Write a protein that binds this ligand. Structure first.
Ligand SMILES: CC(C)C[C@@H]1CCO[C@@H]2[C@H](CN[C@@H]2C(=O)N[C@H]2[C@H]3O[C@H](SCC/C=C\[C@H]2C)[C@H](O)[C@@H](O)[C@H]3O)C1
Ligand SMILES: [K+]
Ligand SMILES: [Mg+2]
Ligand SMILES: [Mg+2]
Ligand SMILES: [Mg+2]
Ligand SMILES: [Mg+2]
Ligand SMILES: [Mg+2]
Ligand SMILES: [Mg+2]
Ligand SMILES: [Mg+2]
Ligand SMILES: [Mg+2]
Ligand SMILES: [Mg+2]
Ligand SMILES: [Mg+2]
Ligand SMILES: [Mg+2]
Ligand SMILES: [Mg+2]
Ligand SMILES: [Mg+2]
Ligand SMILES: [Mg+2]
Ligand SMILES: [Mg+2]
Ligand SMILES: [Mg+2]
Ligand SMILES: [Mg+2]
Ligand SMILES: [Mg+2]
Ligand SMILES: [Mg+2]
Ligand SMILES: [Mg+2]
Ligand SMILES: [Mg+2]
Ligand SMILES: [Mg+2]
Ligand SMILES: [Mg+2]
Ligand SMILES: [Mg+2]
Ligand SMILES: [Mg+2]
Ligand SMILES: [Mg+2]
Ligand SMILES: [Mg+2]
Ligand SMILES: [Mg+2]
Ligand SMILES: [Mg+2]
Ligand SMILES: [Mg+2]
Ligand SMILES: [Mg+2]
Ligand SMILES: [Mg+2]
Ligand SMILES: [Mg+2]
Ligand SMILES: [Mg+2]
Ligand SMILES: [Mg+2]
Ligand SMILES: [Mg+2]
Ligand SMILES: [Mg+2]
Ligand SMILES: [Mg+2]
Ligand SMILES: [Mg+2]
Ligand SMILES: [Mg+2]
Ligand SMILES: [Mg+2]
Ligand SMILES: [Mg+2]
Ligand SMILES: [Mg+2]
Ligand SMILES: [Mg+2]
Ligand SMILES: [Mg+2]
Ligand SMILES: [Mg+2]
Ligand SMILES: [Mg+2]
Ligand SMILES: [Mg+2]
Ligand SMILES: [Mg+2]
Ligand SMILES: [Mg+2]
Ligand SMILES: [Mg+2]
Ligand SMILES: [Mg+2]
Ligand SMILES: [Mg+2]
Ligand SMILES: [Mg+2]
Ligand SMILES: [Mg+2]
Ligand SMILES: [Mg+2]
Ligand SMILES: [Mg+2]
Ligand SMILES: [Mg+2]
Ligand SMILES: [Mg+2]
Ligand SMILES: [Mg+2]
Ligand SMILES: [Mg+2]
Ligand SMILES: [Mg+2]
Ligand SMILES: [Mg+2]
Ligand SMILES: [Mg+2]
Ligand SMILES: [Mg+2]
Ligand SMILES: [Mg+2]
Ligand SMILES: [Mg+2]
Ligand SMILES: [Mg+2]
Ligand SMILES: [Mg+2]
Ligand SMILES: [Mg+2]
Ligand SMILES: [Mg+2]
Ligand SMILES: [Mg+2]
Ligand SMILES: [Mg+2]
Ligand SMILES: [Mg+2]
Ligand SMILES: [Mg+2]
Ligand SMILES: [Mg+2]
Ligand SMILES: [Mg+2]
Ligand SMILES: [Mg+2]
Ligand SMILES: [Mg+2]
Ligand SMILES: [Mg+2]
Ligand SMILES: [Mg+2]
Ligand SMILES: [Mg+2]
Ligand SMILES: [Mg+2]
Ligand SMILES: [Mg+2]
Ligand SMILES: [Mg+2]
Ligand SMILES: [Mg+2]
Ligand SMILES: [Mg+2]
Ligand SMILES: [Mg+2]
Ligand SMILES: [Mg+2]
Ligand SMILES: [Mg+2]
Ligand SMILES: [Mg+2]
Ligand SMILES: [Mg+2]
Ligand SMILES: [Mg+2]
Ligand SMILES: [Mg+2]
Ligand SMILES: [Mg+2]
Ligand SMILES: [Mg+2]
Ligand SMILES: [Mg+2]
Ligand SMILES: [Mg+2]
Ligand SMILES: [Mg+2]
Ligand SMILES: [Mg+2]
Ligand SMILES: [Mg+2]
Ligand SMILES: [Mg+2]
Ligand SMILES: [Mg+2]
Ligand SMILES: [Mg+2]
Ligand SMILES: [Mg+2]
Ligand SMILES: [Mg+2]
Ligand SMILES: [Mg+2]
Ligand SMILES: [Mg+2]
Ligand SMILES: [Mg+2]
Ligand SMILES: [Mg+2]
Ligand SMILES: [Mg+2]
Ligand SMILES: [Mg+2]
Ligand SMILES: [Mg+2]
Ligand SMILES: [Mg+2]
Ligand SMILES: [Mg+2]
Ligand SMILES: [Mg+2]
Ligand SMILES: [Mg+2]
Ligand SMILES: [Mg+2]
Ligand SMILES: [Mg+2]
Ligand SMILES: [Mg+2]
Ligand SMILES: [Mg+2]
Ligand SMILES: [Mg+2]
Ligand SMILES: [Mg+2]
Ligand SMILES: [Mg+2]
Ligand SMILES: [Mg+2]
Ligand SMILES: [Mg+2]
Ligand SMILES: [Mg+2]
Ligand SMILES: [Mg+2]
Ligand SMILES: [Mg+2]
Ligand SMILES: [Mg+2]
Ligand SMILES: [Mg+2]
Ligand SMILES: [Mg+2]
Ligand SMILES: [Mg+2]
Ligand SMILES: [Mg+2]
Ligand SMILES: [Mg+2]
Ligand SMILES: [Mg+2]
Ligand SMILES: [Mg+2]
Ligand SMILES: [Mg+2]
Ligand SMILES: [Mg+2]
Ligand SMILES: [Mg+2]
Ligand SMILES: [Mg+2]
Ligand SMILES: [Mg+2]
Ligand SMILES: [Mg+2]
Ligand SMILES: [Mg+2]
Ligand SMILES: [Mg+2]
Ligand SMILES: [Mg+2]
Ligand SMILES: [Mg+2]
Ligand SMILES: [Mg+2]
Ligand SMILES: [Mg+2]
Ligand SMILES: [Mg+2]
Ligand SMILES: [Mg+2]
Ligand SMILES: [Mg+2]
Ligand SMILES: [Mg+2]
Ligand SMILES: [Mg+2]
Ligand SMILES: [Mg+2]
Ligand SMILES: [Mg+2]
Ligand SMILES: [Mg+2]
Ligand SMILES: [Mg+2]
Ligand SMILES: [Mg+2]
Ligand SMILES: [Mg+2]
Ligand SMILES: [Mg+2]
Ligand SMILES: [Mg+2]
Ligand SMILES: [Mg+2]
Ligand SMILES: [Mg+2]
Ligand SMILES: [Mg+2]
Ligand SMILES: [Mg+2]
Ligand SMILES: [Mg+2]
Ligand SMILES: [Mg+2]
Ligand SMILES: [Mg+2]
Ligand SMILES: [Mg+2]
Ligand SMILES: [Mg+2]
Ligand SMILES: [Mg+2]
Ligand SMILES: [Mg+2]
Ligand SMILES: [Mg+2]
Ligand SMILES: [Mg+2]
Ligand SMILES: [Mg+2]
Ligand SMILES: [Mg+2]
Ligand SMILES: [Mg+2]
Ligand SMILES: [Mg+2]
Ligand SMILES: [Mg+2]
Ligand SMILES: [Mg+2]
Ligand SMILES: [Mg+2]
Ligand SMILES: [Mg+2]
Ligand SMILES: [Mg+2]
Ligand SMILES: [Mg+2]
Ligand SMILES: [Mg+2]
Ligand SMILES: [Mg+2]
Ligand SMILES: [Mg+2]
Ligand SMILES: [Mg+2]
Ligand SMILES: [Mg+2]
Ligand SMILES: [Mg+2]
Ligand SMILES: [Mg+2]
Ligand SMILES: [Mg+2]
Ligand SMILES: [Mg+2]
Ligand SMILES: [Mg+2]
Ligand SMILES: [Mg+2]
Ligand SMILES: [Mg+2]
Ligand SMILES: [Mg+2]
Ligand SMILES: [Mg+2]
Ligand SMILES: [Mg+2]
Ligand SMILES: [Mg+2]
Ligand SMILES: [Mg+2]
Ligand SMILES: [Mg+2]
Ligand SMILES: [Mg+2]
Ligand SMILES: [Mg+2]
Ligand SMILES: [Mg+2]
Ligand SMILES: [Mg+2]
Ligand SMILES: [Mg+2]
Ligand SMILES: [Mg+2]
Ligand SMILES: [Mg+2]
Ligand SMILES: [Mg+2]
Ligand SMILES: [Mg+2]
Ligand SMILES: [Mg+2]
Ligand SMILES: [Mg+2]
Ligand SMILES: [Mg+2]
Ligand SMILES: [Mg+2]
Ligand SMILES: [Mg+2]
Ligand SMILES: [Mg+2]
Ligand SMILES: [Mg+2]
Ligand SMILES: [Mg+2]
Ligand SMILES: [Mg+2]
Ligand SMILES: [Mg+2]
Ligand SMILES: [Mg+2]
Ligand SMILES: [Mg+2]
Ligand SMILES: [Mg+2]
Ligand SMILES: [Mg+2]
Ligand SMILES: [Mg+2]
Ligand SMILES: [Mg+2]
Ligand SMILES: [Mg+2]
Ligand SMILES: [Mg+2]
Ligand SMILES: [Mg+2]
Ligand SMILES: [Mg+2]
Ligand SMILES: [Mg+2]
Ligand SMILES: [Mg+2]
Ligand SMILES: [Mg+2]
Ligand SMILES: [Mg+2]
Ligand SMILES: [Mg+2]
Ligand SMILES: [Mg+2]
Ligand SMILES: [Mg+2]
Ligand SMILES: [Mg+2]
Ligand SMILES: [Mg+2]
Ligand SMILES: [Mg+2]
Ligand SMILES: [Mg+2]
Ligand SMILES: [Mg+2]
Ligand SMILES: [Mg+2]
Ligand SMILES: [Mg+2]
Ligand SMILES: [Mg+2]
Ligand SMILES: [Mg+2]
Ligand SMILES: [Mg+2]
Ligand SMILES: [Mg+2]
Ligand SMILES: [Mg+2]
Ligand SMILES: [Mg+2]
Ligand SMILES: [Mg+2]
Lengths: 48, 275
RNA sequence: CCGAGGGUAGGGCCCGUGACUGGGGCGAAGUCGUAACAAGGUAGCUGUACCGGAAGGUGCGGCUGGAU
RNA sequence: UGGGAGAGGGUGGUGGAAUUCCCGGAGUAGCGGUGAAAUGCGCAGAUACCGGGAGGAACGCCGAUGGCGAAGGCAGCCACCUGGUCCACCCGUGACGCUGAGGCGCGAAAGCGUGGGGAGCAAACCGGAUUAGAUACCCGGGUAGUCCACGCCCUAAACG
RNA sequence: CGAUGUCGGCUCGUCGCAUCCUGGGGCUGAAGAAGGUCCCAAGGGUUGGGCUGUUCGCCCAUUAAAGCGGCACGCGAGCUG
RNA sequence: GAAUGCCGGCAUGAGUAACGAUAAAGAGGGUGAGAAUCCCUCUCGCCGUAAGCCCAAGGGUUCCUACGCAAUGGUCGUCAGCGUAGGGUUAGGCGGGACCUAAGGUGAAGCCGAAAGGCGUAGCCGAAGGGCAGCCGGUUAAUAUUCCGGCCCUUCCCGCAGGUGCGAUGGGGGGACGCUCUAGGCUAGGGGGACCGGAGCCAUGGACGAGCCCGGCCAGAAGCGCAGGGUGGGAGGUAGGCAAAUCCGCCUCCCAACAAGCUCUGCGUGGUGGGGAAGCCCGGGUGACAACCCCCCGAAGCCAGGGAGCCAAGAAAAGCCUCUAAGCACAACCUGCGGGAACCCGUACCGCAAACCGACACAGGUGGGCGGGUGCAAGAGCACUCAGGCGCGCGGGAGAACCCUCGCCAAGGAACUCUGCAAGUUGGCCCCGUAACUUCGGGAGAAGGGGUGCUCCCUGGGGUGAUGAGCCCCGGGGAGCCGCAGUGAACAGGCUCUGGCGACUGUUUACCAAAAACACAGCUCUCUGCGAACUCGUAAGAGGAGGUAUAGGGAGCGACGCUUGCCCGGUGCCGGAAGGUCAAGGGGAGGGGUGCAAGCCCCGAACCGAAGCCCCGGUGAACGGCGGCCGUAACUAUAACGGUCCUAAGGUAGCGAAAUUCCUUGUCGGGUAAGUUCCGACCUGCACGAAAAGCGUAACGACCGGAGCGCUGUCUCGGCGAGGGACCCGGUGAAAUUGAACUGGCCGUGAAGAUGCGGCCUACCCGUGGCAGGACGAAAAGACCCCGUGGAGCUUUACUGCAGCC
RNA sequence: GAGCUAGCCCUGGCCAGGGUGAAGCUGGGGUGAGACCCAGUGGAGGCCCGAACCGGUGGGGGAUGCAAACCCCUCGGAUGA
């Protein structure tokens, strides 16, 4: 049947993307945390 | 004159529709329409604040002239009477000798081709707007401003009217459609006559889908719900209220008066509604 | 081919009968009240409506076949 | 053809008296009700009185043993629409008449449907009396209804 | 109680005997026929149906008879539910 | 050494289950160390409203070619969506951007919030909507509306000519809109041709034929033709369209008005450019100078912004046109023509799937377009087939039990069972015919029955054409023929009678409940006079509503019919300027501490002093509630009647052993041979009852009862047969579980149910196919039950707070 | 975190074929005029049958599955809430 992951590049970019994170106190803490931890990717990569 | 149907489906049994016999023009005035932004009952937070709304037919808003003291002295001809889906009353297209075109809500008996006019000197004729002070005591009236220059607020729905009861200083006394007795300032404009489409109240919707067309989503009884949802929720099997009947928010709903006590307009209401 | 009739299926009318139920007639000396005939002790009667153990009562309108 | 009398019918308008309620004033110890009472109402200011307002229903005197209508029935006043009817003249038609199974229409009150309206009155209902009882008669309340519009019902001591 | 699945049915049986029938008996208020009562006897047999989830029970039609109990009220790693 | 401990390694189960749709394979020839599995050929089968083809998402090199087979592939592998390498995606016109606006988002102004932030008109962003200029063919191993060929087109810049009051983010017009139904004319697509073109073919009894088989087109600028869409022309007045306006609007007059004219699309034709089959021969070549024509059917697509009807009344903005404003009128704009200029990103491949979402090459899920032919009444249904695509990545045998899916069955026909569960039966179309009841629609496909193929003859109407022929779509009448059987295959209701519940169509517990539950039109109560009530928010601000009592919120009831009784003492809510109580505050009789004193400081009675509560009334479609004992009639029995206690009042109408009745399978009647269920009654209703509505009700229901007819493998009562497994051989090879084991029966014993203890009995060692009584077998630290001063949801006249309101 | 699911907002798209035959309209009858009757036309509907599409009624299978909800047969809706 219809499962839960129904990928969508625009949806992915609008929801978890770099600009979505920067616009918000909580999102900026996400970037701060993922930088402090050394993540190679601060944000999901979508072909765009 | 509501129209009936033969029972050729279970719903057509009781369905009645308006006759539309007063209507003379069946597409609106392009210059006087704008889109009506449907809300679904949701406010600017996205939250439902009026339950059970949404899903009705798409509509355009017809701009209505609720001032009419806008064009004192300028006569107009009644060009057409049209269907308006945003209100129970019909509406009348007015062609001012100015060349300006405007909608008003259509009073009972208003005829296409007759003239209307607004102002302190206008004749007391169905369709004319005057300040309340210049309208004879006893006149039946609609589209009443509640404060001067603020726009017609009272007696606007199909069939309704106010009656001028008498004067006292700068105020006239009105019997509102609810039966309330109220002082309204004398400079407030009002339009001679009652609102038309008085048969509106006798329409029988006939089926559940008819409510859906109007944007009315199904209404769920509290007694049908659970205690997390409603004071009437829960109980094994059916249950009586088992407490004073209440709203989803817990306030009582049979009797409890709710008009604010220290409201300034209290000084201007003579007698609360009856019946 | 038609054809007595037999068969299948579905209707119409009538008669008999049926747990139980509705009132009706009748029946020497049952129980309750007293509605009507006298202004019958609230004049009567009346069509209708509502109510009451019961006769009845009351509302509305009508009749005199009502008295003084 | 010329006249007449009339609550004949329908629509709209509109006039005063009274009742109720509301507001203002003035005023105080009861008012109401009956055969007598009680319930009820009243010092939270009633009744009685004055002024103002609102609203519905019915039209006093004239009014009669009267008038009109086929009946049911019709009553303030005004205008409009409309029916019946009688008299005069003796002018026109030339028996074109009488009745009338069916049919059709009208049909008091009560009652029913959908809206409205609701002052007074008042089935049901509540209370107070009476009574052996009192699901009554009398008294205090009182909802349909009584009123308007449309649509039904089609009964009667619809009787001379 | 870090689980011994619980009523009825179906299927499959197997056992006890305080024996329902069939076999053998004594007594009889046993003429015969048919019964009653007790003793011996477990080899085999012990029907179909209506009602109810029913076990049971009542009823119809039969029968030589239409037995009663145990097996975790036998049997859900066999079925049903 | 244990913690259902942690991490890792390795065992057991076991050469066991399985190897993922039962659409299906066989052979020959090649390649190679190796072939059921790769390549080729012939034969066979499967899909064909797809299992074919084209888009969009998502995926991201998976595409093409060479070289490979360790791993991946459920077997094999020489093959591959795998490994290595090289190549491959070409645009002014296709899609998106340099254009527009939608919800929404963001946000100069402004508003609000301890901070973070929240709002917010304009504006801006935002598309699968609006707008905008490319069609056909060829070419590559792999791209093509992109390259090439042919014929077309758009915008920008500059110039020439001609014309005009030019000029805008401003005004206006237009863009610009629903649902159902639908006309005319076309196109796409399709059928037929004795006509035209074609390699061939004559078989096995016949046919050299009006034979068979194959094909008979596509794109096209201007012009023209057919069919449509859009659009009145002129003048005068003018105060409205937030400046101006010659535009638009409004008034008047004249003319044109089923028209015309102008304009714009569609279709046909059209210079020209292309394509072009079977068969044969090696994707190619030929066929071929290919032919390219006539008739019929015909869209849901096109003309289109077409027409009609209806109520629920159906986006915006730009492009475009017109108007004028600053300005400028040596400019500018409009038209025509010429030359120049024209950027960025995507483009491979998969795409109902082995490349997307499901951990898998997973029987599941995934939006749009095309989707041929014949017959079956129609159709996207069904059977078979075209183009195209496949045989599902383990096979070979065998022909047990048993399981699955399937076929048939003597006599009987529900005897099965909780229940006809399941499976039969019925089954399409045409005609005949059809009951109670009913809200007059319906019930209805009621029921029940007859017809149905093929052949010849005659014949009616409709479409095309011509009015005919021909073609085509519906028929009708007569006479025949064959079979067991004519919707001969496939697709395609079993029916009736009678109850309960719910009016109805709908909705629901994704994944154990689809229902009698929710909703529903409709009815009632209640709040709300508008900056409404109410809701979300600390607020600003929103929703309500650009609505206004015929409206909006809350609550119950639940189409409709006939109805909905009595109680206001308690709780609620509503009304009540009195009285009682009442906090802060007012007041300050009167005290007190200290100071030499002025003073400073403290306590403080009466009394005045809100809401709330008390108190007085009202109110039931507000929360709710609607009695007991005893007696009585000229047979008995039973009480219409009476007595008395109590209550705020003592349950009315209607219904009743009921979705409610304990005793209970009540009693009686019906149906049955037999009826704890069913239906009809009765009424001592344990414990109905009137909007948590009462009693009915036509129609409706995958709801739940009861009966009957039809028919059956449900059953008596089983039998046989088919295929996929099970079984044997070759290949690959899990799992839960497991203290270790050299693991029998009885009767006892034992923590009370023993393979393991005692006594006896029985028993050579090891497997394979089967069955499930035991190993108190397995998966799961019982969900029942209790315990824990463990937790959580929910309630209230428990306690105590808080929002909110007064 | 609403790429699953629930509701709403904006903008698009989809629903083979067959059946029933409301209002209206026209004509005819009818009447003083009417109501109204009949025929034709018409094409309404939370109308009927049935694919796609959306569901998930009963049974069977599956149950270390093809699948952490699937498969077969049957069945509901299918112009509308
Ligand atoms: C009167 C009655 C209440 C006494 C009661 C009977 C119920 O159970 C029995 C209790 C006694 N213990 C039993 C029990 O726990 N049984 C479990 C089973 O669970 C499933 S069987 C399907 C579920 C059934 C029963 C569960 C409760 C497993 O397979 C079985 O192994 C077993 O664990 C007594
Ligand atoms: K329990
Ligand atoms: Mg889903
Ligand atoms: Mg999605
Ligand atoms: Mg995307
Ligand atoms: Mg997207
Ligand atoms: Mg998105
Ligand atoms: Mg976001
Ligand atoms: Mg982002
Ligand atoms: Mg911050
Ligand atoms: Mg910061
Ligand atoms: Mg890095
Ligand atoms: Mg992130
Ligand atoms: Mg109707
Ligand atoms: Mg009717
Ligand atoms: Mg109208
Ligand atoms: Mg506009
Ligand atoms: Mg907002
Ligand atoms: Mg709300
Ligand atoms: Mg809402
Ligand atoms: Mg409104
Ligand atoms: Mg209107
Ligand atoms: Mg005012
Ligand atoms: Mg209404
Ligand atoms: Mg609407
Ligand atoms: Mg509801
Ligand atoms: Mg509930
Ligand atoms: Mg519930
Ligand atoms: Mg919640
Ligand atoms: Mg709570
Ligand atoms: Mg609560
Ligand atoms: Mg409750
Ligand atoms: Mg409940
Ligand atoms: Mg209950
Ligand atoms: Mg409940
Ligand atoms: Mg209660
Ligand atoms: Mg409450
Ligand atoms: Mg009021
Ligand atoms: Mg015979
Ligand atoms: Mg009397
Ligand atoms: Mg007497
Ligand atoms: Mg008397
Ligand atoms: Mg008397
Ligand atoms: Mg009485
Ligand atoms: Mg006083
Ligand atoms: Mg009044
Ligand atoms: Mg004469
Ligand atoms: Mg009458
Ligand atoms: Mg009254
Ligand atoms: Mg008389
Ligand atoms: Mg236990
Ligand atoms: Mg364990
Ligand atoms: Mg246990
Ligand atoms: Mg059995
Ligand atoms: Mg003897
Ligand atoms: Mg024996
Ligand atoms: Mg039994
Ligand atoms: Mg037992
Ligand atoms: Mg029993
Ligand atoms: Mg014997
Ligand atoms: Mg036993
Ligand atoms: Mg026991
Ligand atoms: Mg026991
Ligand atoms: Mg057992
Ligand atoms: Mg089991
Ligand atoms: Mg069992
Ligand atoms: Mg077990
Ligand atoms: Mg076991
Ligand atoms: Mg240890
Ligand atoms: Mg360990
Ligand atoms: Mg474990
Ligand atoms: Mg541990
Ligand atoms: Mg571990
Ligand atoms: Mg580990
Ligand atoms: Mg290691
Ligand atoms: Mg390990
Ligand atoms: Mg290992
Ligand atoms: Mg080992
Ligand atoms: Mg092994
Ligand atoms: Mg094994
Ligand atoms: Mg396995
Ligand atoms: Mg497997
Ligand atoms: Mg299959
Ligand atoms: Mg199969
Ligand atoms: Mg072969
Ligand atoms: Mg082979
Ligand atoms: Mg091979
Ligand atoms: Mg090999
Ligand atoms: Mg193969
Ligand atoms: Mg090959
Ligand atoms: Mg061969
Ligand atoms: Mg096909
Ligand atoms: Mg991927
Ligand atoms: Mg390999
Ligand atoms: Mg290999
Ligand atoms: Mg290698
Ligand atoms: Mg491998
Ligand atoms: Mg695999
Ligand atoms: Mg090789
Ligand atoms: Mg490539
Ligand atoms: Mg190009
Ligand atoms: Mg640029
Ligand atoms: Mg923009
Ligand atoms: Mg704050
Ligand atoms: Mg901010
Ligand atoms: Mg954006
Ligand atoms: Mg944009
Ligand atoms: Mg776009
Ligand atoms: Mg484009
Ligand atoms: Mg082109
Ligand atoms: Mg190409
Ligand atoms: Mg020009
Ligand atoms: Mg428009
Ligand atoms: Mg518009
Ligand atoms: Mg649009
Ligand atoms: Mg519509
Ligand atoms: Mg063409
Ligand atoms: Mg064709
Ligand atoms: Mg052409
Ligand atoms: Mg002007
Ligand atoms: Mg076009
Ligand atoms: Mg050549
Ligand atoms: Mg289409
Ligand atoms: Mg179009
Ligand atoms: Mg149109
Ligand atoms: Mg806009
Ligand atoms: Mg200038
Ligand atoms: Mg110049
Ligand atoms: Mg650029
Ligand atoms: Mg490409
Ligand atoms: Mg698929
Ligand atoms: Mg597709
Ligand atoms: Mg693939
Ligand atoms: Mg595979
Ligand atoms: Mg798949
Ligand atoms: Mg074809
Ligand atoms: Mg067919
Ligand atoms: Mg295969
Ligand atoms: Mg397949
Ligand atoms: Mg396979
Ligand atoms: Mg074998
Ligand atoms: Mg056979
Ligand atoms: Mg048989
Ligand atoms: Mg039978
Ligand atoms: Mg039979
Ligand atoms: Mg049976
Ligand atoms: Mg069952
Ligand atoms: Mg049954
Ligand atoms: Mg069958
Ligand atoms: Mg069939
Ligand atoms: Mg019948
Ligand atoms: Mg009938
Ligand atoms: Mg019947
Ligand atoms: Mg019936
Ligand atoms: Mg009928
Ligand atoms: Mg039939
Ligand atoms: Mg025939
Ligand atoms: Mg034949
Ligand atoms: Mg069928
Ligand atoms: Mg239902
Ligand atoms: Mg239901
Ligand atoms: Mg009901
Ligand atoms: Mg009903
Ligand atoms: Mg209902
Ligand atoms: Mg439906
Ligand atoms: Mg339906
Ligand atoms: Mg669940
Ligand atoms: Mg569920
Ligand atoms: Mg679940
Ligand atoms: Mg289920
Ligand atoms: Mg359920
Ligand atoms: Mg259902
Ligand atoms: Mg529900
Ligand atoms: Mg309902
Ligand atoms: Mg109702
Ligand atoms: Mg109401
Ligand atoms: Mg709040
Ligand atoms: Mg709004
Ligand atoms: Mg608004
Ligand atoms: Mg409401
Ligand atoms: Mg409901
Ligand atoms: Mg009835
Ligand atoms: Mg009370
Ligand atoms: Mg009270
Ligand atoms: Mg009270
Ligand atoms: Mg209670
Ligand atoms: Mg009480
Ligand atoms: Mg009653
Ligand atoms: Mg009973
Ligand atoms: Mg019984
Ligand atoms: Mg009952
Ligand atoms: Mg009960
Ligand atoms: Mg019982
Ligand atoms: Mg019982
Ligand atoms: Mg019995
Ligand atoms: Mg019987
Ligand atoms: Mg009964
Ligand atoms: Mg009894
Ligand atoms: Mg209640
Ligand atoms: Mg209840
Ligand atoms: Mg009932
Ligand atoms: Mg019914
Ligand atoms: Mg249903
Ligand atoms: Mg159902
Ligand atoms: Mg039966
Ligand atoms: Mg069998
Ligand atoms: Mg076989
Ligand atoms: Mg062997
Ligand atoms: Mg091997
Ligand atoms: Mg050991
Ligand atoms: Mg050992
Ligand atoms: Mg052993
Ligand atoms: Mg052994
Ligand atoms: Mg023991
Ligand atoms: Mg033992
Ligand atoms: Mg042993
Ligand atoms: Mg041992
Ligand atoms: Mg030992
Ligand atoms: Mg020992
Ligand atoms: Mg031993
Ligand atoms: Mg031993
Ligand atoms: Mg032994
Ligand atoms: Mg073996
Ligand atoms: Mg074995
Ligand atoms: Mg075992
Ligand atoms: Mg077992
Ligand atoms: Mg154990
Ligand atoms: Mg065991
Ligand atoms: Mg065990
Ligand atoms: Mg488990
Ligand atoms: Mg435990
Ligand atoms: Mg547990
Ligand atoms: Mg316990
Ligand atoms: Mg404690
Ligand atoms: Mg403790
Ligand atoms: Mg605790
Ligand atoms: Mg808690
Ligand atoms: Mg707080
Ligand atoms: Mg409040
Ligand atoms: Mg978030
Ligand atoms: Mg979503
Ligand atoms: Mg989305
Ligand atoms: Mg459809
Ligand atoms: Mg169709
Ligand atoms: Mg038919
Ligand atoms: Mg028409
Ligand atoms: Mg339908
Ligand atoms: Mg049908
Ligand atoms: Mg299912
Ligand atoms: Mg079945
Ligand atoms: Mg499962
Ligand atoms: Mg399936
Ligand atoms: Mg199926
Ligand atoms: Mg259907
Ligand atoms: Mg359909």
């Amino acid at each position: 049947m219809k499962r839960t992951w129904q990928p969508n590049r625009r949806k992915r970019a609008k929801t978890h993307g770099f600009r979505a994170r920067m616009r918000t106190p909580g999102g900026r803490k996400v970037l701060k945390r993922r930088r402090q931890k050394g993540r190679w990717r601060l944000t999901p990569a979508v072909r765009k | 004159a509501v129209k009936k149907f033969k029972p050729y489906t279970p719903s057509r049994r009781f369905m009645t529709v308006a006759d539309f016999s007063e209507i003379t023009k069946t597409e609106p005035e392009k210059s006087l329409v704008k889109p009506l932004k449907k809300t679904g009952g949701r406010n600017n937070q996205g939250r439902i604040t009026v339950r059970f709304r949404g899903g009705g037919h798409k509509r355009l808003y017809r701009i209505i002239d609720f001032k009419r003291w806008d064009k004192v002295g300028i006569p107009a001809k009644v060009a057409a009477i049209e269907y308006d889906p945003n209100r129970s009353a019909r509406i009348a297209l007015l062609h001012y000798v100015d060349g300006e075109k405007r909608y008003i809500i259509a009073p009972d008996g208003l005829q296409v081709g007759q003239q209307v006019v607004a102002g302190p000197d206008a004749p007391i004729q169905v369709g004319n707007a005057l300040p309340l002070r210049f309208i004879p005591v006893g006149t039946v009236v609609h589209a009443v401003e509640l404060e001067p220059k603020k726009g017609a607020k009272l007696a606007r729905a199909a069939g309704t009217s106010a009656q001028i009861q008498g004067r006292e200083g700068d105020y006239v006394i009105l019997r509102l459609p609810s039966g309330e007795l109220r002082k309204v300032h004398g400079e407030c404009y009002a339009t001679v006559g009652a609102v038309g489409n008085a048969d509106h109240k006798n329409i029988v919707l006939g089926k559940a889908g008819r409510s859906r067309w109007l944007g009315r989503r199904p209404h769920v009884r509290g007694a049908a719900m659970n205690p997390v949802d409603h004071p009437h929720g829960g109980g094994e099997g059916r249950a009586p209220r088992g407490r004073p009947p209440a709203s989803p928010w817990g306030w009582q709903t049979k009797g409890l008066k709710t008009r604010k006590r220290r409201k300034p307009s209290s000084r201007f209401i003579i007698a609360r509604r009856k019946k």
